[PDB]
Short mmCIF file of C-alpha atoms and ligand atoms in Angstrom, two decimals:
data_model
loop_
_atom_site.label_atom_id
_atom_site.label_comp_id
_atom_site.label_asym_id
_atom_site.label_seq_id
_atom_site.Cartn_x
_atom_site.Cartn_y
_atom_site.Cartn_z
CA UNK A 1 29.79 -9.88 23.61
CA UNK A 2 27.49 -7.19 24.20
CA UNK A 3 23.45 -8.46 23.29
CA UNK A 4 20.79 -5.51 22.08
CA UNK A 5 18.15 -3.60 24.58
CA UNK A 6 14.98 -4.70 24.65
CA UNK A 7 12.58 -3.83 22.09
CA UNK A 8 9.58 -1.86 23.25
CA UNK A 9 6.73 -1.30 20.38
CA UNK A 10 3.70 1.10 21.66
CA UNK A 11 0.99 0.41 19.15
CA UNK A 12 -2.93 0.61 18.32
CA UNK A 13 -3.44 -2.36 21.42
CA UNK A 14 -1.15 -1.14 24.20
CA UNK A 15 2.73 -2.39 24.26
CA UNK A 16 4.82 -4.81 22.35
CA UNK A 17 8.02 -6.34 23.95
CA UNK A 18 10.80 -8.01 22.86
CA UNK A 19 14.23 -8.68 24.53
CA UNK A 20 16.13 -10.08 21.63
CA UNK A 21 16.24 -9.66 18.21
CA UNK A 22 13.63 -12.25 16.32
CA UNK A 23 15.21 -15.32 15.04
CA UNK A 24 11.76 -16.42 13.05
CA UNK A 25 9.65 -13.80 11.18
CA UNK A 26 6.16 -14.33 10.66
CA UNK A 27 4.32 -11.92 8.93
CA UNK A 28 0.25 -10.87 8.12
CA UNK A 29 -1.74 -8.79 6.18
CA UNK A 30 -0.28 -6.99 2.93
CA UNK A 31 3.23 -6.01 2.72
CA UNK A 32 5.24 -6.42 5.58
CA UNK A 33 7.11 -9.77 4.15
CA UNK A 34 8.43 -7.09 2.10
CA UNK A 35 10.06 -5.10 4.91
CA UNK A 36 11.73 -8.13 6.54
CA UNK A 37 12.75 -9.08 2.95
CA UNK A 38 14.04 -5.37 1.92
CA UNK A 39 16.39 -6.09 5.34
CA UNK A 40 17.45 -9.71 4.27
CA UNK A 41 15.16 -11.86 6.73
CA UNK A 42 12.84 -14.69 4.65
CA UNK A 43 9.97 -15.22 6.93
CA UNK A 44 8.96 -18.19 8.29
CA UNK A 45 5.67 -17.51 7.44
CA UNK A 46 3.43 -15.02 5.81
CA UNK A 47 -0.16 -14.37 4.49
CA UNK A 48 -0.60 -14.94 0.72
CA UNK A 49 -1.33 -12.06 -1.77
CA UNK A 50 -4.94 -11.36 -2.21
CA UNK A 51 -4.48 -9.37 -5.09
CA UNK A 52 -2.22 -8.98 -8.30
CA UNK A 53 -1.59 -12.82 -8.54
CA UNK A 54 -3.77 -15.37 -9.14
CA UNK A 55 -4.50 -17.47 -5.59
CA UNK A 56 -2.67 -20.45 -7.32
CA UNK A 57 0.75 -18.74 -7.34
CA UNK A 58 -0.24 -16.18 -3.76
CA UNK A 59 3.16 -14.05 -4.43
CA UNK A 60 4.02 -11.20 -5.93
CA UNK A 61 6.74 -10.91 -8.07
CA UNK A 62 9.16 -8.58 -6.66
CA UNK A 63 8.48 -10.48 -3.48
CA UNK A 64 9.48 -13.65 -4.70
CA UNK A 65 12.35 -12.35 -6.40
CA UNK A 66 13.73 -11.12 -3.38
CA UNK A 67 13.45 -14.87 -1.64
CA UNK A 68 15.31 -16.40 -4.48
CA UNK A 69 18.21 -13.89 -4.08
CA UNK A 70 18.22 -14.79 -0.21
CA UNK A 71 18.15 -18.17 -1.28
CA UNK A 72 15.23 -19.04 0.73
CA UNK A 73 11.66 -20.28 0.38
CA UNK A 74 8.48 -18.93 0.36
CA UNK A 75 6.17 -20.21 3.08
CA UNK A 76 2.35 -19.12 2.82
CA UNK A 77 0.12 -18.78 5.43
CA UNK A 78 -3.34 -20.57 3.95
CA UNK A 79 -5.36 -17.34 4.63
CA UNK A 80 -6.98 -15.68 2.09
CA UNK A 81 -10.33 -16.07 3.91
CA UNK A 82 -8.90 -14.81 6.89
CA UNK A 83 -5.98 -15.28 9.64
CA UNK A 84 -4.85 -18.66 10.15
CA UNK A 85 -4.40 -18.83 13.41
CA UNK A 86 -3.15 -22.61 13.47
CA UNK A 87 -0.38 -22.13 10.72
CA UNK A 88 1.05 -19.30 12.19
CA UNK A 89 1.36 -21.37 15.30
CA UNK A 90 3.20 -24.20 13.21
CA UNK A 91 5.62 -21.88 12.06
CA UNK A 92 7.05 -21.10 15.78
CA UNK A 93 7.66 -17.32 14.93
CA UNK A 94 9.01 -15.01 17.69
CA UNK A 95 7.25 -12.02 16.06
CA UNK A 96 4.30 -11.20 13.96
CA UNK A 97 4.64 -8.43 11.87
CA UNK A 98 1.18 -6.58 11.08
CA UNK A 99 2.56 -2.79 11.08
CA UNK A 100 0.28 -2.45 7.92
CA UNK A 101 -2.67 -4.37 8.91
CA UNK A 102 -6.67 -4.41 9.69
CA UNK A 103 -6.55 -6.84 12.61
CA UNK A 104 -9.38 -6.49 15.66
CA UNK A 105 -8.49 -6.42 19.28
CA UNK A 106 -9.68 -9.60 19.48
CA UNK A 107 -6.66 -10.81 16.25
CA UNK A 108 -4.20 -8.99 18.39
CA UNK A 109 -4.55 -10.57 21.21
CA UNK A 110 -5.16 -14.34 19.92
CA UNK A 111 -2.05 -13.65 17.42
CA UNK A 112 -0.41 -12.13 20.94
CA UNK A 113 -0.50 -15.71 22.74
CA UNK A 114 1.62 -17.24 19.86
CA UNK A 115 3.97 -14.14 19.65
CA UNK A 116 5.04 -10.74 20.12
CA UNK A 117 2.93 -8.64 17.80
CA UNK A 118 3.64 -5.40 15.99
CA UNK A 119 0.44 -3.81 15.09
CA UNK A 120 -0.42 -0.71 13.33
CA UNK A 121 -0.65 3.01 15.23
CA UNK A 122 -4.03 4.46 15.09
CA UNK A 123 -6.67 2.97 12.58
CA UNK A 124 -7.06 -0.17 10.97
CA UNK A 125 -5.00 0.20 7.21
CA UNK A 126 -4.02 3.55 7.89
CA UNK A 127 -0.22 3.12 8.04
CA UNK A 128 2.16 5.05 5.25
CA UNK A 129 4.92 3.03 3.29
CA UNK A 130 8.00 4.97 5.59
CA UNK A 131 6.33 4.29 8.80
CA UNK A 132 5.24 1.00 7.95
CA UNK A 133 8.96 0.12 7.82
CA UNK A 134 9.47 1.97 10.63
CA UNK A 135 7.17 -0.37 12.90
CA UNK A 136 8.08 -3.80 11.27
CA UNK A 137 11.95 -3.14 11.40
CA UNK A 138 11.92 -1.96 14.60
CA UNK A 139 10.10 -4.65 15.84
CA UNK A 140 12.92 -6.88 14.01
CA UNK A 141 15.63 -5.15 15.80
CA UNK A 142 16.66 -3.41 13.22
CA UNK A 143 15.37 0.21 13.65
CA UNK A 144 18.76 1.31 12.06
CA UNK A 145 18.94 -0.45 9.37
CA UNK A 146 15.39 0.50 8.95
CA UNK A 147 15.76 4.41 8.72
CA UNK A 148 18.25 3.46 6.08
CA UNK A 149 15.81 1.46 4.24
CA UNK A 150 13.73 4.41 3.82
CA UNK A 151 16.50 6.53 3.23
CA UNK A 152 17.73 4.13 -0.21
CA UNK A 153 13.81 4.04 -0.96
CA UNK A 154 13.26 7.22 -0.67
CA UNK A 155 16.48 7.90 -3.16
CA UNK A 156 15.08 5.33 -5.42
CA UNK A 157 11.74 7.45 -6.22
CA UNK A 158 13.74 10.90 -6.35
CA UNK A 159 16.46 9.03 -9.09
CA UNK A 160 13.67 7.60 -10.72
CA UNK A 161 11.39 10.83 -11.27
CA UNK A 162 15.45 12.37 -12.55
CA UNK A 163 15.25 9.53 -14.91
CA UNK A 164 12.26 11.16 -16.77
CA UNK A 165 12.48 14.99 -17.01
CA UNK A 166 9.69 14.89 -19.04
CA UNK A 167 7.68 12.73 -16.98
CA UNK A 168 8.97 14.20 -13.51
CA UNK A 169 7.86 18.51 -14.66
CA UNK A 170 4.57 17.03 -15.95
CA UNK A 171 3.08 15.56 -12.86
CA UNK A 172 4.60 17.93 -10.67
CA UNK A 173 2.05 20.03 -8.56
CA UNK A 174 -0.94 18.03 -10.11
CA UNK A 175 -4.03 17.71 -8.09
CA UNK A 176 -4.57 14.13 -7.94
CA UNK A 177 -7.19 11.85 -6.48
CA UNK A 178 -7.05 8.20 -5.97
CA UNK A 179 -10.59 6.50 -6.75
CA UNK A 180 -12.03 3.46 -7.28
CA UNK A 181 -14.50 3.71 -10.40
CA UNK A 182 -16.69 1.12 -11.28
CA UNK A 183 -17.31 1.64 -14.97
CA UNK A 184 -20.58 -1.02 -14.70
CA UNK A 185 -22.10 0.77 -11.60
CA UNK A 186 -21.17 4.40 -11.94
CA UNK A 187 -23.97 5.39 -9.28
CA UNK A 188 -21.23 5.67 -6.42
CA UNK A 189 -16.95 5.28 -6.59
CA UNK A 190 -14.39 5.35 -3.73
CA UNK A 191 -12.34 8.13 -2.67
CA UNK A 192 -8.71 7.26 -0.98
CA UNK A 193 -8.14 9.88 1.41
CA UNK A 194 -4.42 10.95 2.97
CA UNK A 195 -4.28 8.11 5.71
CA UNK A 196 -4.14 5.65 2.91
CA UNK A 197 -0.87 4.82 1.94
CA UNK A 198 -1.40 4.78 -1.73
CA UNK A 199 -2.91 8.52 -1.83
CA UNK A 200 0.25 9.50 -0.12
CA UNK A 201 2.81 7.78 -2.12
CA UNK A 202 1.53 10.18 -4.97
CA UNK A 203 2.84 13.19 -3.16
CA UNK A 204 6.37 11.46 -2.81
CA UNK A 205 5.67 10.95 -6.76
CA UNK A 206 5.62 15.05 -6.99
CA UNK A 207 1.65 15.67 -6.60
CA UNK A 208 -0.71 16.87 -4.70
CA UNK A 209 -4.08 16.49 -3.55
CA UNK A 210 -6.77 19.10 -4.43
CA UNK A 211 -8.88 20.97 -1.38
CA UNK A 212 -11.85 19.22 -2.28
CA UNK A 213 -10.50 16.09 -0.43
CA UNK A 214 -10.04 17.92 3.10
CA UNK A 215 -14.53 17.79 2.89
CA UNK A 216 -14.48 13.61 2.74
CA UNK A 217 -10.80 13.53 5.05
CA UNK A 218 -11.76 12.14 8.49
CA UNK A 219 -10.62 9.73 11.48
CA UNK A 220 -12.83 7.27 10.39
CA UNK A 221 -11.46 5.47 7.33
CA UNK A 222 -8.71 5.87 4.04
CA UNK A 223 -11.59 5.87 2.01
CA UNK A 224 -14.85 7.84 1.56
CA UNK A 225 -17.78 6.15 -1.17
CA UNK A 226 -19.19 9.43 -2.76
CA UNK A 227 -22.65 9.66 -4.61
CA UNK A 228 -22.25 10.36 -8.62
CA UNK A 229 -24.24 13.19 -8.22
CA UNK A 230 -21.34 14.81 -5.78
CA UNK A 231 -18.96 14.46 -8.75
CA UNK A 232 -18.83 18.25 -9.39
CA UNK A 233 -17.17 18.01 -5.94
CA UNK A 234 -13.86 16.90 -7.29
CA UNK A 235 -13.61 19.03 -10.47
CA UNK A 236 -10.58 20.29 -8.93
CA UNK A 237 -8.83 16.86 -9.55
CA UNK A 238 -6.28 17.50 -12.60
CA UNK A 239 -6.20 13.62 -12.78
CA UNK A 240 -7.77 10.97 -11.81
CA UNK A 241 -6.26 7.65 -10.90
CA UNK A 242 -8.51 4.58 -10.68
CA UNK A 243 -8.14 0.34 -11.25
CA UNK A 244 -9.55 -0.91 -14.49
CA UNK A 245 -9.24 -1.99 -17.89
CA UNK A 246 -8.82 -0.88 -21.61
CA UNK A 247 -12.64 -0.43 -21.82
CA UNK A 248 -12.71 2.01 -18.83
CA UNK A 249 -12.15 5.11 -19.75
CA UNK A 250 -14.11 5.75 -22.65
CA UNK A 251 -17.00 4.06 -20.74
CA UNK A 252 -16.56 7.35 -17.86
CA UNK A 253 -16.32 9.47 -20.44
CA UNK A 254 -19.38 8.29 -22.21
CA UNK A 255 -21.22 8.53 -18.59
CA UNK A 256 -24.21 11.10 -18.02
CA UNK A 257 -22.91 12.14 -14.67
CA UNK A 258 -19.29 11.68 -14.36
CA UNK A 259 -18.36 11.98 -17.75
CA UNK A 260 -19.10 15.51 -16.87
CA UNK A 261 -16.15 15.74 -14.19
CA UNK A 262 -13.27 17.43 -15.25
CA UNK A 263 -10.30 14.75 -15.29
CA UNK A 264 -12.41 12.34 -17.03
CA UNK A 265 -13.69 14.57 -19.89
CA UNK A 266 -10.21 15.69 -20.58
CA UNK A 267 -9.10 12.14 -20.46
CA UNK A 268 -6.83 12.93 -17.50
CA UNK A 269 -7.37 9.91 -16.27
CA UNK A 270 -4.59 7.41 -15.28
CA UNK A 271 -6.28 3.35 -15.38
CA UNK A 272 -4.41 1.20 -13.59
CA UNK A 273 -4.90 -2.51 -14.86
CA UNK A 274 -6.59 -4.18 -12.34
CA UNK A 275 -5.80 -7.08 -10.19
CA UNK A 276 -2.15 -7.22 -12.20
CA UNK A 277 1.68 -6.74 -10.49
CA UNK A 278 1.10 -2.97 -10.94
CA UNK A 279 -2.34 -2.57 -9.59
CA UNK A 280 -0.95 -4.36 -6.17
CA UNK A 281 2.30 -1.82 -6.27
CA UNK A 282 -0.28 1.08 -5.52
CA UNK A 283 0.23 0.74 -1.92
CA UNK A 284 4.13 0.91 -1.87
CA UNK A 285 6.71 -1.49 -0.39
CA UNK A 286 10.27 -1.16 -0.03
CA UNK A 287 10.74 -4.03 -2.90
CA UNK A 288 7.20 -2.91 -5.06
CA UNK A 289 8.47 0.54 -5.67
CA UNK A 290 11.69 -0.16 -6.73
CA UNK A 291 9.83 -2.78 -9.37
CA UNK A 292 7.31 -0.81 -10.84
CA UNK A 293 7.71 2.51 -10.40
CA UNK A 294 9.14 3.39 -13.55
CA UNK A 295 5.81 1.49 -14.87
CA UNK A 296 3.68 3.51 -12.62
CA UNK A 297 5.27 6.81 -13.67
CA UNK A 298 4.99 6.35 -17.55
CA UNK A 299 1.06 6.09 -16.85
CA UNK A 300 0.67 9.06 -14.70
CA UNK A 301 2.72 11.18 -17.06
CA UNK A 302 0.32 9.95 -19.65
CA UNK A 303 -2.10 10.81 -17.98
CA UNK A 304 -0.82 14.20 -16.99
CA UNK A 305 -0.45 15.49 -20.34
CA UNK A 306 -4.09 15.61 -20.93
CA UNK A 307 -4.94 17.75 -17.83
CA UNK A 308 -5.46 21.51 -18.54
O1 6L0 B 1 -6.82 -6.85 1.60
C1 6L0 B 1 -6.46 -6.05 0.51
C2 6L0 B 1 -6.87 -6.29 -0.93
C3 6L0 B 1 -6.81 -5.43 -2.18
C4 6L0 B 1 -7.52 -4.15 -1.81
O2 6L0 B 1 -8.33 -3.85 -0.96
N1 6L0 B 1 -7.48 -3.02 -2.67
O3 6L0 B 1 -8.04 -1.79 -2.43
C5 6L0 B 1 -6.75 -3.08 -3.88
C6 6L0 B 1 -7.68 -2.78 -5.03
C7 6L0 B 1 -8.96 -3.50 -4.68
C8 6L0 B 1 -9.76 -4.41 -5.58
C9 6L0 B 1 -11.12 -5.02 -5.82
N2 6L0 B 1 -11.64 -4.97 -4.50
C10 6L0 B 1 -12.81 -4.49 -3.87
O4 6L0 B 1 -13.10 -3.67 -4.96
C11 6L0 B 1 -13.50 -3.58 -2.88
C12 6L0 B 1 -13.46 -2.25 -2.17
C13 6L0 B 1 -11.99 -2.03 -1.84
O5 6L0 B 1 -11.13 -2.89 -1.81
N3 6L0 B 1 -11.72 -0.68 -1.51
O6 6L0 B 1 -10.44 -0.27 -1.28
C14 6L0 B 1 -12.81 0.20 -1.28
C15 6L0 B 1 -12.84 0.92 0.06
C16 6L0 B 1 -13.30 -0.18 0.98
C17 6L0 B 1 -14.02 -1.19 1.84
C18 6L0 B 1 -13.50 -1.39 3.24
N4 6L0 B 1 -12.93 -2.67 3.01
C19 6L0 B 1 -11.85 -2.88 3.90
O7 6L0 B 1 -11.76 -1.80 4.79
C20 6L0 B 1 -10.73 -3.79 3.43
C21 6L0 B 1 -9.40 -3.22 2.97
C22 6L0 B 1 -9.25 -2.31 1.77
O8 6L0 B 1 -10.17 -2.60 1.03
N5 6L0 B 1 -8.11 -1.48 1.96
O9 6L0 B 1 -8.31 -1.11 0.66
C23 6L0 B 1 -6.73 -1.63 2.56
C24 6L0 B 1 -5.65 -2.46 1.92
C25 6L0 B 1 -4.54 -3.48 2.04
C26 6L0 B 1 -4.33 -3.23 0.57
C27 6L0 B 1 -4.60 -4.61 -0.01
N6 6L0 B 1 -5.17 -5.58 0.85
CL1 CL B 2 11.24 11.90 -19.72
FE1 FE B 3 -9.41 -2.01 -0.84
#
C-alpha cells in the first residue's frame, strides 16, 4: 500500500523530522499525554503530574481515565525534579512530544539523540491548548485527525456554555484576569498574560481581558509579578480568577492594599482550589476540558454575578 510523507516539524530549535508515523509515544512536560490520548495512542512513557495529584498517584484523573478505556497502562517518567533522561531512553520512543513545554536548547538536543522531538514555537510555556494539539498530533502523524480534535473540543466548550444560559450571558464580555494571589504575602501576585494558555482559554469561555493587561503583555514571559501598590492598575478587571482556598477571599478583601481593587471588594473573585483536579484543568487539554469544565464554569458564573 501507499505509506505517509514525511513529517517535517519547524519549531523553537530548528527542524523536526520524521518519515513514518511513531509507533512509541513518549511524552514531557504538562499535557501532551493528553493529546496522544485524545487521538487513541497510550504512551510509552510520560512525565508525572506535578500538580493536582498527590506525587504518590502522579496522574490526573481524566488522564487516567482515558488509559483505562484504551485498555492500556500508565507508564511514568520518574521526573518531578526534572527530565529523566535515562527513562525516556528505556522506553525506546520514536518521538518526544514537548509541544507545551519549558525545555532549554541544551534538553532539546540531549532529548534529540534518543528521538525526534517536537518542541514548542517561540517561548518556553507559551503554547495555546489548539496549537498545542496542533504540534503534538502532527508530529504523531496525525495532523488530520488533529484539526478534528480541536474541532470536537472546540464544540465541547460552545455546547457546554448552551448548557447554562444563565451561566453562559453572565460571563460573557467580562474583563477577566488570571492571577496568582498569595493571601499570606499580599506584597506582590502574578499576572498571566495572553501567551499563557490558561488566560486564553477564558476568552474561548466568552471573556475578555481588560486594557490594563496590554501595559504588563510582553515577549518575555506568560506571566508578569506586579507590586501591591500597582493594584489600582487592574481596577478594570470585572473578576478576578486566582488558586486558593476557602479562607482566601475574605483574607483579600480584608487586605489594606488590594482589598481596595475592584474585583476583590465586590467579591468578584473566582478561587480556584488549589493543587486539586480543577486547579490543574486551568491550562486546558483536549481530555481536562471536557472533565471539568462544567466545574470550572459554575465558579466563574459565581463569580460573575458579583461584578458591577
Ligand atoms: O510545571 C508546572 C506546575 C504547576 C504550575 O506552574 N502552575 O502555575 C499551576 C499553579 C501553580 C502552583 C504553586 N506553584 C508556584 O506557586 C509558583 C509560581 C508559579 O507556578 N507561577 O505560575 C508563577 C509565575 C512563575 C515562575 C516562572 N516559573 C516557571 O516559569 C515554571 C512554569 C510555570 O510556573 N508555568 O506556570 C507554566 C506551566 C505548565 C503548567 C503546569 N506545569
Ligand atoms: Cl444556567
Ligand atoms: Fe506556574
Amino acid at each position: 500500500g501507499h505509506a505517509p510523507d514525511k513529517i517535517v516539524l519547524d519549531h523553537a530549535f530548528g527542524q523536526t523530522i520524521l518519515d513514518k508515523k511513531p509507533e512509541r509515544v513518549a511524552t514531557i512536560a504538562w499535557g501532551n499525554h493528553d493529546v496522544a490520548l485524545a487521538l487513541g495512542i497510550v504512551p510509552v512513557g510520560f512525565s508525572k503530574a506535578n500538580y493536582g495529584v498527590s506525587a504518590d498517584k502522579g496522574v490526573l484523573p481524566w488522564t487516567e481515565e482515558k488509559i483505562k478505556e484504551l485498555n492500556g497502562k500508565a507508564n511514568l517518567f520518574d521526573d518531578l525534579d526534572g527530565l529523566n533522561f535515562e527513562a525516556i531512553s528505556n522506553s525506546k520512543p520514536d518521538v518526544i512530544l514537548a509541544g507545551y513545554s519549558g525545555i532549554t536548547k541544551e534538553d532539546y538536543d540531549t532529548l534529540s539523540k534518543i528521538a525526534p522531538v517536537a518542541a514548542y514555537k517561540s517561548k518556553p510555556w507559551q503554547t495555546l491548548w489548539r496549537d498545542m494539539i496542533k504540534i503534538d498530533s502532527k508530529a504523531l502523524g496525525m495532523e488530520k485527525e488533529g484539526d478534528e480534535l480541536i474541532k470536537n473540543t472546540e464544540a465541547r466548550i460552545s455546547k457546554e456554555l448552551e448548557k447554562h444560559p444563565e451561566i453562559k450571558g453572565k460571563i460573557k464580555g467580562k474583563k477577566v484576569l488570571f492571577t496568582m494571589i498569595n493571601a499570606a504575602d499580599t506584597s506582590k501576585f502574578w499576572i498571566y498574560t495572553s501567551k499563557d494558555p490558561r488566560a486564553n482559554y477564558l476568552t474561548d469561555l466568552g471573556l475578555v481581558f481588560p486594557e490594563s493587561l496590554k501595559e504588563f503583555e510582553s515577549e518575555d514571559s506568560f506571566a508578569k509579578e506586579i507590586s501591591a501598590e500597582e493594584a489600582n492598575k487592574i481596577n478594570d478587571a470585572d473578576v478576578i480568577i486566582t488558586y486558593g482556598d476557602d479562607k482566601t477571599l475574605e483574607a483579600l478583601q480584608k487586605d489594606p492594599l488590594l482589598g481596595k481593587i475592584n474585583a476583590i471588594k465586590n467579591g468578584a473573585v473566582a478561587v480556584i482550589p488549589d493543587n486539586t483536579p480543577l486547579a490543574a484543568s486551568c491550562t486546558p487539554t483536549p481530555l481536562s476540558i471536557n472533565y471539568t469544565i462544567e466545574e470550572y464554569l459554575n465558579l466563574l458564573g459565581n463569580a460573575c454575578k458579583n461584578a458591577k
